[PDB]
């Protein structure tokens, strides 16, 4: 269903519609951000609700041969979102179907390094017989990361569940990993580090107990 | 217009599926009003809609499956979808519907077409089809320098999607991050949200995180304490 476009920051996207009408159309284009509510960009082939930034665009149905398109100059990080064409047209029948989302992919914002906050098990947790470790990596781009657990001076290769990046309301990635230990294990080691690579370097943060 | 949805947030294969939506702002009975779903992996579904006559009419691919109605007297749109299986996991969106004509000729022989466009639209609920049930999730505080701290609440082990989390609910409304959260080998998920705080507001003031588990349904609070 997905088709990917990527485009560099700034330029202007052009987004076909999947189906080409048979006979004269009507098209809608909506735009969907993961996690919140779809919205009506262009209604009627070229109509845009009021409050939609002038910057996206359809194309008029002239009666020439001309697919329908969405046109948004200026791409922002913000236009990054799902995009659907909902084809109307007269020898195709009432379309149950949105289609396939074209998932557009801005680039070229600049590079950010991650905030990195580790916290060790609460007090409650050990009194609950667990404990768990919890590396929270964010306000990064690009999106890759490595996140590594060390226990003093060699790397846990267990016990750690690690979220794959997202974007998030500030689009910069964000990404948790969680390194679940029993208390005799925690009480173990002198102490524990989350370690985290981007973009070539590393950084790292480390708790013991306490 | 504004609007809502609500739901099971569970339920097992072969039963029935139950989401309700409340509209505010706009009077129910002067419009059409639809449902579109999103599943894992696929894209937005429309499942059918209501016209202000109260007639139905749905999706082929739904299989008659589903059944749409309003309550004026409660201003609430519903649907329920029948005989579910783990496909029908999706999030659940209702929206409003307008008809517009596309005439390209002469009306008595029949040269227009209709089409709807929806405009306004809700945010979704999370509906999932499990064999399992709602498991509540046990919160821990995770306690707290660039003149800042960090705060944050373990929520562990819950199902299924989502969560809510709430701190103070509006006084600390940042800079706080609640994260996306992870789906561990067990098949629980636990998330955590943290907030920065100042040291010197640490030991004064008091935070709290709301975590909301609907389909548990579960509630709970935690202050966070150094």
């Known amino acids: 269903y997905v088709s990917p476009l990527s485009v560099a920051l700034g330029e202007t996207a052009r987004i076909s519609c999947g189906r080409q009408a048979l006979g004269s159309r009507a098209v809608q284009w909506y735009q969907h951000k993961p996690g919140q509510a779809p919205i009506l960009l262009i209604y009627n082939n070229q109509d845009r609700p009021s409050g939609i930034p002038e910057r996206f665009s359809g194309t008029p149905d002239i009666n020439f041969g001309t697919t329908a398109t969405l046109t948004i100059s200026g791409v922002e990080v913000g236009d990054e979102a799902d995009y659907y064409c909902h084809m109307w047209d007269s020898r195709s029948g009432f379309s149950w179907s949105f289609g396939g989302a074209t998932r557009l992919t801005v680039l070229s914002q600049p590079k950010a390094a991650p905030s990195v906050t580790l916290f060790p098990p609460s007090s409650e947790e050990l009194q609950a017989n667990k404990a768990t470790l919890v590396c929270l990596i964010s306000d990064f781009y690009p999106g890759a990361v490595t996140v590594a657990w060390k226990a003093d001076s060699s790397p846990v290769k267990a016990g750690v569940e690690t979220t794959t990046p997202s974007k998030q309301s500030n689009n910069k990635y964000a990404a948790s990993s969680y390194l679940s230990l029993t208390p005799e294990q925690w009480k173990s080691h002198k102490s524990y580090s989350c370690q985290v690579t981007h973009e070539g370097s590393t950084v790292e943060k480390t708790v013991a107990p306490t | 217009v504004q609007l809502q949805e609500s739901g099971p947030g569970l339920v097992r294969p072969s039963e029935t599926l139950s989401v309700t939506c409340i509209v505010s702002?706009?009077?129910?009975?002067?419009?059409?009003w639809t449902w579109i779903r999103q599943s894992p992996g696929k894209g937005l579904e429309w499942i059918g809609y209501?016209?202000?006559?109260?007639?139905?009419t749905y999706n082929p691919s739904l299989n008659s499956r589903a059944v749409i109605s309003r309550d004026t007297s409660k201003n609430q749109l519903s649907l329920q979808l029948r005989s579910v299986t783990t496909a029908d996991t999706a999030i659940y969106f209702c929206?409003?519907?307008?008809?517009?004509?596309?005439?390209?000729?002469?009306?008595?022989?029949?040269?227009?077409?209709?089409?709807?466009?929806?405009?306004?639209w809700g945010k979704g609920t999370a509906v999932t089809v499990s064999s399992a049930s709602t498991k509540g999730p046990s919160v821990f505080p995770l306690a707290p320098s660039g003149g800042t701290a960090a705060l944050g609440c373990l929520v562990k082990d819950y199902f299924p999607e989502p969560v809510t989390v709430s701190w103070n609910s509006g006084a600390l409304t940042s800079g706080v991050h609640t994260f996306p959260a992870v789906l561990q080998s067990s098949g629980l998920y636990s998330l955590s949200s943290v907030v920065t705080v100042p040291s010197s507001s640490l030991g004064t003031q008091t935070y709290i995180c709301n975590v909301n588990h609907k389909p548990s349904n579960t509630k709970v609070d935690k202050k966070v304490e150094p």
């Open positions: 929206a409003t519907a307008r008809r517009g004509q596309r005439i390209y000729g002469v009306v008595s022989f029949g040269e227009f077409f209709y089409y709807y466009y929806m405009d306004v």
């Open positions: 702002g706009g009077s129910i009975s002067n419009y059409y």
């Open positions: 209501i016209s202000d006559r109260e007639t139905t």
